[PDB]
Design a protein around this ligand. Structure first.
Ligand SMILES: [Cl-]
Ligand SMILES: [Cl-]
Lengths: 162, 132, 7
């Protein structure tokens, strides 16, 4: 039936965040901090997907005793949306199997969501310029497309120690 | 013993955050007070469950000195359609007196959900949705 | 450019 770009945006937003929660949960971590940020994360992601400015959604999982990345989960946005498609899906099966592959985490591994955007993006309250933790000595792995609504898609990958 | 049900259009018509705020407004009838604050405090937990579609087949249940309110969520084509939606205001105070709100929760998330909820409320709880 | 949330 009929759908709008905002429908596709909303589907991808909720399911990116659902997927990241699942990653946190299945990685053995407490999703409470992710819940505390759900509202802020939703508004930022939905806004920058709506304007086409969101490039990547990133979850750094770091060791707080050394401040170095243990692992990192990326969702790259693919802007291939079409008004005459209508199909949608979320593929979290592959995410589950990649969790062993991403690496052993410390008991109290902490996490932080970050958003990579085009320069001309609109401001979103509370979000400001930040910096990536180093990925030196880490290896990117790709899981292919894990969420799509009507051509707007998210390609998931993870970084492991090499 | 009176039972009332409502059915809110969720993702992709509303995002999970918006869905919960709409349910907050229904349960507080627009009143700002302690109950609204408790409900707002667990927003992230409730939105995460909505994104999991936990309220699709097992409802959010509010109990009070008065009727028992069941709140379901529609998703995908049903949410855009709206055919089965019922978002009408409630004719009664849905959290009057000794109130409680039960969120349906997948068995495997009960650990972190109930712990997260208990930091903000002894009235907003979670239950294994496999039991209904 | 990367964005992060500051409470
Ligand atoms: Cl799961
Ligand atoms: Cl954070």
């Amino acid at each position: 039936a009929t759908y709008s770009y905002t429908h596709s945006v909303t589907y991808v937003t909720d399911n990116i965040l659902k997927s990241l929660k699942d990653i946190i949960l299945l990685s053995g971590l407490d999703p409470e901090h992710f819940a505390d940020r759900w509202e802020s994360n939703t508004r930022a992601i939905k806004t920058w997907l709506g304007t086409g400015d969101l490039r990547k959604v990133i979850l750094e999982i770091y060791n707080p005793a050394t401040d170095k990345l243990v692992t990192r989960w990326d969702i790259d946005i693919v802007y291939g949306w079409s008004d005459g498609d209508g199909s949608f899906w979320t593929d979290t099966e592959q995410l589950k199997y990649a969790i062993k592959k991403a690496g052993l985490l410390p008991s109290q591994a902490k996490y932080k969501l970050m958003l990579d955007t085009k320069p001309g993006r609109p401001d979103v309250e509370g979000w400001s310029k930040g910096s990536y933790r180093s990925t030196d000595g880490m290896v990117k792995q790709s899981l292919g497309s894990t969420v799509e609504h009507s051509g707007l898609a998210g390609q998931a990958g993870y970084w492991r120690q090499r | 013993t009176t039972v009332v049900s409502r059915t809110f259009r969720s993702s992709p018509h509303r995002d999970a955050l918006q869905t919960w705020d709409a349910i907050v407004e229904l349960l507080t009838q627009g009143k700002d007070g302690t109950a609204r604050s408790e409900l707002r405090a667990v927003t992230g937990v409730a939105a995460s469950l909505i994104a999991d579609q936990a309220p699709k087949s097992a409802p959010i249940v509010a109990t009070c000195d008065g009727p028992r309110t069941r709140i379901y969520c529609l998703f995908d084509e049903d949410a855009i359609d709206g055919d089965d939606a019922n978002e009408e205001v409630l004719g009664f105070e849905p959290l009057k007196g000794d109130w409680g709100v039960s969120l349906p929760c997948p068995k495997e998330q009960l650990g972190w959900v109930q712990s997260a909820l208990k930091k903000h409320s002894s009235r907003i709880i979670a239950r294994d949705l496999s039991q209904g | 450019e990367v964005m992060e949330f500051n409470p």
